[PDB]
Amino acid sequence: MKLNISYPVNGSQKTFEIDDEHRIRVFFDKRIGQEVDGEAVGDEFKGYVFKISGGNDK
RNA sequence: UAAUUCUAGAGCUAAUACAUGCUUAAAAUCUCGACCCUUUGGAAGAGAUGUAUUUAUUAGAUAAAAAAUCAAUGUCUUCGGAC
C-alpha cells in the first residue's frame, strides 16, 4: 500500500511504500478527518502528527 | 485502475463570474404636533412620499329649462353674505 504524504508548509510532498501488516492497522476503522501518530508505524516518524484526506481502492 | 471524453490529495492568481455597497436640483403636499392666548385662532419643530410585489376602498362626468330653500363662504362688502 502506498502512502501519499504531503507537508503544506514547505509545500513538498513524497510518496511512501510499506509492506507489513501490523504497522497499518492504526489507520484502520477511521473516517477521514482525524489524526494518528507516526510512532505507531515509524521509527522515522517519532512525534509526527498526521491527518487522512482521501484514497483509492484496488 | 486491464480498462472510457474516469479522476484524488497538496500548492498559487483574475472577471461584464459570485457576494456586497455610497453619491444629487429645487419645489409642493400631507399628517403629527413645542408653544401662543385667544378669538372664528395660528404655530416652531418633526416625519412621510421613486419604481416593483399583494389586498381593500374612491375618480374614471355627459340627453332640455327656472325658482323656493338650509347655511357656509371667492369677492364690491351692499358684513346682507346675495353672488
From Swiss-Prot:
Subcellular localization(s) per the UniProt record: Cytoplasm; Nucleus, Nucleolus
Miscellaneous note of the record: Present with 66000 molecules/cell in log phase SD medium.
Family: Belongs to the eukaryotic ribosomal protein eS6 family.
Oligomeric and partner information: Component of the small ribosomal subunit (SSU). Mature yeast ribosomes consist of a small (40S) and a large (60S) subunit. The 40S small subunit contains 1 molecule of ribosomal RNA (18S rRNA) and 33 different proteins (encoded by 57 genes). The large 60S subunit contains 3 rRNA molecules (25S, 5.8S and 5S rRNA) and 46 different proteins (encoded by 81 genes). Interacts with snoRNA U3. uS11 interacts with MPP10. Component of the ribosomal small subunit (SSU) processome composed of at least 40 protein subunits and snoRNA U3.
Its job: Component of the ribosome, a large ribonucleoprotein complex responsible for the synthesis of proteins in the cell. The small ribosomal subunit (SSU) binds messenger RNAs (mRNAs) and translates the encoded message by selecting cognate aminoacyl-transfer RNA (tRNA) molecules. The large subunit (LSU) contains the ribosomal catalytic site termed the peptidyl transferase center (PTC), which catalyzes the formation of peptide bonds, thereby polymerizing the amino acids delivered by tRNAs into a polypeptide chain.
Name recorded for this polypeptide: Small ribosomal subunit protein eS6A
Name of encoding gene: RPS6A
Residues of the full protein shown: 1 to 58 of 236
